Amino acid sequence: EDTEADVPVTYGEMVLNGANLVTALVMGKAVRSLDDVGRHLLDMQEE
Amino acid sequence: EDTEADVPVTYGEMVLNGANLVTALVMGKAVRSLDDVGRHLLDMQEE
């Protein structure tokens, strides 16, 4: 026995909100954290 | 034969920027004025 005790956590979560909602019902697709992916792709060509 | 002239225009250009650049790369889908279409769709579900 290391220990009868432990430290569990609570459920994650996600939704289609800002740009994920638009594309889902317009382009028909969606991505985890499109805001992030979008920020990092655009910024990446600004160095 | 009527007046030879015309009130002719120039050319209209459409570019990939911002939202539809990210989605064109990530989702491979491009759409016209996605920024405008996105505005209204996020609008019309709010009073």
UniProtKB/TrEMBL annotation, chains A, B:
Domain of life: Viruses
The protein, known as: Major capsid protein
The organism of origin for this protein: Human herpesvirus 2
The gene coding this protein: UL19
